[PDB]
Amino acid sequence: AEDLAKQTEIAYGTLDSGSTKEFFRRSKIAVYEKMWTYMRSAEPSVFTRTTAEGVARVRKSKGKFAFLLESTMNEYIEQRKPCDTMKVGGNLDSKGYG
């Protein structure tokens, strides 16, 4: 996450109405807060309607966009065709499904 602060050309975003988006909004951390403000004011719309749209957009991006999502969804895409996405960095928070 810190490496994102080191640059501004590469964009990133989070899914709408999803836990991840709510985490940045209420994150009282020095690095996570910064990210919440970068994306809210960034044009065009980085908050994709669904995960399917976001992943495809990153594929066509060729590297100018990074998609922020949960690890579980980040393991049935790196091992599925055309196999053109990779997870960089550990996890930011420990959560679970219910």
Partner 1 sequence: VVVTTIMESPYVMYKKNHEMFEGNDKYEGYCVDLASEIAKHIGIKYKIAIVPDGKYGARDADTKIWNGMVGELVYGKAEIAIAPLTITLVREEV
Partner 2 sequence: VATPKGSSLRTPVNLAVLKLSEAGVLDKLKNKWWYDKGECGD
Ligand X SMILES: N[C@@H](CCC(=O)O)C(=O)O
Ligand Y SMILES: NS(=O)(=O)c1cc2c(cc1Cl)N[C@H]([C@H]1C[C@H]3C=C[C@@H]1C3)NS2(=O)=O
Q: Which residues bind partner 2 (CB under 8 A)?
A: 5-9, 23, 26-29, 93-95
Dist CA 39 CA 10 (whole Å): 11
CA 39, 44, 48, 49 torsion: positive or negative?
positive
Q: Which of residues 5-64 bind ligand X (CB under 6 A)?
A: 15, 18-20, 51
* Partner touching 33 among partner 2, partner 1, ligand X, none, CB below 5 to 8 Å by kind: none
Closer CB to partner 2, 28 or 62, in the complex? 28
Asked whether 12 and 63 are in contact (CB, 8 A), the reply is no
Which residues of this protein are in contact with ligand X, per CB under 6 A?
15, 18-20, 51, 69-70, 73
